[PDB]
Amino acid sequence: RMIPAVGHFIPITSITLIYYRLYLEDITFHLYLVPNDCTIRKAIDEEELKFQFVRINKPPPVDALYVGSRYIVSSSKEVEILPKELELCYRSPRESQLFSEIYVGNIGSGINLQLTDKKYMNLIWEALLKPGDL
Amino acid sequence: ARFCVQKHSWDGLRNIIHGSRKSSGLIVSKAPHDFQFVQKPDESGPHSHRLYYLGMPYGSRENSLLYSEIPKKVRKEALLLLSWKQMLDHFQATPHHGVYSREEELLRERKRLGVFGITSYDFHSESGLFLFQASNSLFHCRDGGKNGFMVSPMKPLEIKTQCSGPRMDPKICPADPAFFSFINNNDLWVANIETGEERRLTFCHQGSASVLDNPKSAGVATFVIQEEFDRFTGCWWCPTASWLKTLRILYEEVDESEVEVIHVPSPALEERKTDSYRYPRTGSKNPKIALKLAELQTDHQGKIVSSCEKELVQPFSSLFPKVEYIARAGWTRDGRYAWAMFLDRPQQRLQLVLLPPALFIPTLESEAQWQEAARAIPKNVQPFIIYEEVTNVWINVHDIFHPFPQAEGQQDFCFLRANECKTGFCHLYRVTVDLKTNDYDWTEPLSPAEDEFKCPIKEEVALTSGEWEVLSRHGSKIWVNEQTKLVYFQGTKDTPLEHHLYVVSYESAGEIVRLTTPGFSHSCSMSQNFDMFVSHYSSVSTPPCVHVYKLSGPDDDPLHKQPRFWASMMEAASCPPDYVPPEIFHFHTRADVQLYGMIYKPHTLQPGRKHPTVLFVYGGPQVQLVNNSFKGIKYLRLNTLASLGYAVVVIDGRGSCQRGLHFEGALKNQMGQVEIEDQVEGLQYVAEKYGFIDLSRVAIHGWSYGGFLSLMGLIHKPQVFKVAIAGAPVTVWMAYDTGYTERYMDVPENNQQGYEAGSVALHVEKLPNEPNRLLILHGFLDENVHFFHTNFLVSQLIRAGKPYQLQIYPNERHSIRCRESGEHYEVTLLHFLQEHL
Amino acid sequence: ARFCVQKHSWDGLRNIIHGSRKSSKAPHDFQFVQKPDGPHSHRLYYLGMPYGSRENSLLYSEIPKKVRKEALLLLSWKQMLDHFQATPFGITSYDFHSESGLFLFQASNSLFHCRDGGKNGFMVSPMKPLEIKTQCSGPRMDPKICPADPAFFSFINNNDLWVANIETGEERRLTFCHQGVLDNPKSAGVATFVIQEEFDRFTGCWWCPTASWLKTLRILYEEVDESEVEVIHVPSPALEERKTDSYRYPRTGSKNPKIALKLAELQTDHQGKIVSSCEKELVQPFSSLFPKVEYIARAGWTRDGRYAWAMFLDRPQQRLQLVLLPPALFIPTLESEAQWQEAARAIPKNVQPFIIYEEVTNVWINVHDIFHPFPQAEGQQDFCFLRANECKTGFCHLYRVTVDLKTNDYDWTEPLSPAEDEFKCPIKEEVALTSGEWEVLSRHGSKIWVNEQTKLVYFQGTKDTPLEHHLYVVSYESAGEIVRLTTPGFSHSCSMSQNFDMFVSHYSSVSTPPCVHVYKLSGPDDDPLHKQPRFWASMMEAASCPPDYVPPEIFHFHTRADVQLYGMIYKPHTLQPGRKHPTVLFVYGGPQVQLVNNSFKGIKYLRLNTLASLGYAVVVIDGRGSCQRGLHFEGALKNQMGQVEIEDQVEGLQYVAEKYGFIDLSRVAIHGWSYGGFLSLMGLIHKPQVFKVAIAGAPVTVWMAYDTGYTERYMDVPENNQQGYEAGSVALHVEKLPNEPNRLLILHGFLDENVHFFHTNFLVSQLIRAGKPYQLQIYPNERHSIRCRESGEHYEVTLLHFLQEHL
């Protein structure tokens, strides 16, 4: 008999990468939620560059998130998210890299983009995308 | 005059617990595990040793194999912090998404491994061969010897197979590293590594995939053995090859036909299905066991030519009556004998027995051929009961045993043995015994008497003595150096609150020499060459650090070799922002018995005040709560309790370990009735010494024995304890297994008086009538103490009308594993005290 | 201003509840037997326990002839079984053969039988019941007397049909489906779990009422093959063993067992010894003769035996169709492909199955047992019967319909693939006997009685008001006018006599306990319809509940969409004006059950009155979804179980706040059991600002884990309704529950077999992942309903205390 041991868990840092491509005027965004590391950025950069996508720098979440959380992607109604949720989890670099794509016809005055904690409804991130970044 | 704890919202409590865990101070989550030291030829480089171990360097949440080079002639003024080199290039060893098969997850629950990845491994020194299980199967690699030491990580080679289930418990044959063994589908298998061929040697499991229909098993430890005796294997290699090359394997075959079965929910809740276990409750029948050999012969190219399997020339139950368990078993280093440790049912007579391989004959059903095998056995072949330990309290089982390879002295057999029932304390003894023979007639069956194979003692020399004991359980071992006639061990000679390393000459029992610095508690592991050792130590006010020391000094006097600090593998952290380390104290009782303890005095204290207290308690045997080790990461919730204004009082009353036998032997047949008096006596003392203890508002809180003790306090001492938060309690004692209840409580046929007053569910009418004075917590999937215990208690509360509250953890076994169940456990814990205390 | 309930200790609440229960069963099913003279005129048998040994026993009573009017009469309760025990409560049921006057029942370990008529002697003293000695192993289940022969009877042993004889004591096993738990999935003549629970059918065998020509006797049973049905595990009542039991539980989306109908013939002689005992089957596979047939709702024979009939249902439960099977279509099971092809051709040509009446709806089909086949003349062309259609006009009404039996002379040797209208017979006439925005009670043991000598049908309906059950009568030869036979202002549960001259009425009202009164019809012979009932005697009288009970008050209102709803409210004891009392919204809100009706509630829900004596108001309203109100009203739940019912609760709860004044909308709880628990949780999620706390009892948390018969009927099996499933499962919306503690209690029985403990187990498992708090109360020894009294008291005490503190 031994006293049961309560598990210890620490949140980790993470970043959110914004990618875009412009065809004629329609924008396709690619949003990546990934733990803050070195190799993953210089890999995903090439993976997106293959399809002529490019990066746009926006601040990562300040708070330290737990690994294994689910986040609703929310916006103003004029957007189309083929995956509506994102998931923070480690990923083997030589394997596939998940993301969420967003289709918008014309940005105009800029579109909002928010991640939101599924369990508690926390606004842990935001981004005011503008045509200036394009 | 009193002090009232601040009232927080539920989300507020969640936030403060999240913050207290975020401020943990970036713990390593694992210290370097079991090490292996490998010398290097000096001309090969600047280093002198290579050190292999397990660990996670905070990079991944995956335990992995690492190594480090031990430098030569390190300079003194500057601290050297060794690296952690990877050995398997980018090889993840946890299964996909971290979900294990039921066999290995149950084994992890039995070993209490809360880490992912390679948990253990097997290592052959000469060939330098590493063999382990990773992902869902076996892997192996080579770094030590002829391959030459590596510089860059290399790829592990998967061992191809054709079996169906998981390959459990790999073991490398010492006599030949070209083979290995394992357990598959509850049977035994031997395989080759080079040729890739396999072979099955046991035919006990039908494979009908239904625990109910195929009861037999071969070379595997049952439940009661794994849980209550901590033996996780059933097979053992003979370390010498006998001359075609013949190899032996001692293994046990269990027969669980008549063992009572129970059903336990499965981790897949949607199925609403249960798994069946052979769970022998107190008073029931334990499985039937036996010991068998399994020979196999090979040629120069490594092909298994023949593969027999033998048995004792008499039924195992006939030669050895009154034997209920097989605690430990193994060989000697020459291969001349195989040994085992037998426990009787009341667990009061353990005995070492020595068995020659010649007593194993092939399984001959033709009675004519069998009487020929029983005729061909040599004369001097018979079992030898070298040692027997009879007590009056109970026999704690030790692994400490070291036989000396005997020269051509046919009579004598010398060995060290950590005996504990002789003086009341665990002490090493050097005993030499003459193996007397009788030249039995195995053709005619024999009904052995009580002293058939007992050989008489020639000498019995104590090597250590005093009011202290030698560490012998929970994975503690001794290292014997036969080139200098020394023995390295660990004990509590200095103070019962510290574990230190020692050495003493086993030829001449002189004076003991401590090798570690005082003021800490050390867990250390020697080298096989006895020139270096690594120690893992900490104290109440300092987190752990892992240093490596080098035994230097004149070669003529080896006892007084001074331990030189060579390098470090991990440093302390000191957890500065919000952790006030507790303060150890000690008092005496009215029966003149010294007890220890510790108190977490409240943060931001003021004179002339009173704080609500929380008497944290385990109280059960084989656990010591108060010792000079760092409680900062194990029990930090108690610090958070203190951070709010509660005064936590821990106390190791009579019944705990590390203080001898007669001290622990106070629970015998009175379990439950005596441990609370020590908690209340040690709680009233702190009211005198310190003044901030508010005896008006006293809680109590425990887990799986303290949960049982939380309820006994509220029954016996309702005026002392206002609330009581029991966790996974043990309500009725007639529904717990044999290996533990019989040891302390003497099956209900004999102790029906004590079983009555100890089972807390049979006294439900003495619990408080008022509401909000009892919380109950239990895990649904629990298989150590099942949900029945809480479920039967609730049933008894309703037959009497007493109020209660309850929290169930559906996806949690006996230990809370996921973080969401941990947070919710603490968040609801603070909230109960915040409102009802 | 506001009002605050007086706080008590735990002992206080327990003591007031013990007192309330300290200050608190009518005769069961009856049968009439004429007594040929004598002082009396009939003898009436029933089941009951008179103020003594707690045991439902057989009690008879002599109805006297020419009773006087000036004084009320109270019949005695005679006994029939001298000092017999029927508890493993009491004799739960029995079967009665009128001609020989033989009662056969199962008492708690074995079968017993007795006789009161035929021998020209009616018993005077309670006699000894005789034991039917058996050589079987387990318990005999579901005995039935053979209407063609009062010597032989049938029963079920280990899922296999058996036939025994009373005079000779010999037995015989007719079917061998059980290999003798999971290894054997085949059963013979038993109703499975879904049939017994969700379709209200508790038998698998059906005797033929007429013997044919040694004398042969037919028995129509069904065979079920549960091979590929899922298995679940439920704890055993003996907690100490820590072992579970296995049941076949086909969850929604899974596959129901495979059904098949089979006769079972047997022949005997003048001495009652069985000579032959065969077993037969359809000339074509059941799966091929009738594709798209999922369940067998009901079955039986006609009056003369010339046909066996059954009611078939498909998986969507939107096509119920009557079928009529002749015994000549069942050939013995023949292994040799030669003997099969000669018997497949040796049957007559006109013999075939007929689809007598196909009911096609758009909502669902409620299984009515109301169907009366008329024995006709040679009459080979036509066939007439009475059927209680409901999908025709949206209400359950009676119909007389005559259909002609067209024949095509199939070649039963060659394999056939039937088309959409293979055996559909064309209708000849269809006249509605009843009409209007009411319905004829058809389910829950409610039946009709058809008198053929006087051409009258007696039925129960709610023609006056949806709150009452009355006994009506109308002529089936001519759709004339209906006549109510029960006194208004009550709700009755009548049972006619086999001679159509008397009827007992067990009736009660909101403010009056149940009383059993026997009425004898006396009227002109020339007009049978206008015969008027005369009160004759009272078997039992109402207690009147005098000292502590106060009956609630029924009201009704209209919603925003102009849909009339009903409701009821227990007014708080000792009410002062300008006082806002704390209320409780007790709710069920599910289909097949209504709660607001003019019947005595003071025995089923007196805790609602105990809640009122403290100072709580109670509000019960039956919104859209309940029964006894048509189909388009009940059919508002379709594919939206959860999303509609709670909207009407607040719509009605607000109404009570204006009609009365003592409703404190700040303090209002919500409480229900097994569908109110589902709705309580759906209220606390949708209306947190409306409801302070919730008390969910045994709730259904996820719909993907419930059986097919109930869920697929209302929720459109998951593949086609993946929107309404996730939006109706409360365990998938846990992130919307309250964060504050002391706002959610959860109770559940551990041994629950209808809605398993997994539902609250999974819910708790989702409350932890979201961080929300809760409380919990487990009843380890209680199934779906809290039976024992300790578990019942400890439930109401903790219900008062959770309201005392956190409301």
Author numbering:
A (entry chain B): 976 to 1109
B (entry chain D): 21 to 263, 269 to 862
C (entry chain C): 21 to 44, 50 to 62, 65 to 115, 136 to 227, 231 to 263, 269 to 862
Excerpt from the publication:
Nucleotide-binding domain, leucine-rich repeat receptors (NLRs) mediate innate immunity by forming inflammasomes. Activation of the NLR protein NLRP1 requires autocleavage within its function-to-find domain (FIIND). In resting cells, the dipeptidyl peptidases DPP8 and DPP9 interact with the FIIND of NLRP1 and suppress spontaneous NLRP1 activation; however, the mechanisms through which this occurs remain unknown. Here we present structural and biochemical evidence that full-length rat NLRP1 (rNLRP1) and rat DPP9 (rDPP9) form a 2:1 complex that contains an autoinhibited rNLRP1 molecule and an active UPA–CARD fragment of rNLRP1.
Two-dimensional class averages showed that rDPP9 formed dimers, but only one subunit was bound to NLRP1 in most of the particles. We used the particles with one rDPP9 subunit bound by rNLRP1 for further cryo-EM analysis. After 3D classification, a subset of 182,116 particles was used for final 3D reconstruction, generating a map with a global resolution of 3.18 Å. Unexpectedly, the liganded rDPP9 subunit is bound by two rNLRP1 molecules, which we hereafter term the 2:1 rNLRP1–rDPP9 complex. The first rNLRP1 molecule contains the complete FIIND, which has a conformation nearly identical to that observed in the crystal structure of the free FIIND; the remaining domains of this rNLRP1 molecule are not discernible in the cryo-EM density. In the second rNLRP1 molecule, only the UPA domain is well defined. Three surfaces mediate the formation of the 2:1 rNLRP1–rDPP9 complex. The first surface is mediated by ZU5 of rNLRP1, which binds to one lateral side of the β-propeller domain of rDPP9 (termed the ZU5-binding site of rDPP9). The second interface is formed by the deep insertion of an N-terminal loop (N-loop) from the UPA domain of the second rNLRP1 molecule into the rDPP9 substrate-binding channel (termed the UPA-binding site) (blue box). The substrate-binding groove of rDPP9 is completely blocked by the UPA N-loop. Additionally, the homodimerization interface of the two UPA domains also contributes to formation of the 2:1 complex (termed the UPA dimerization site) (yellow box).
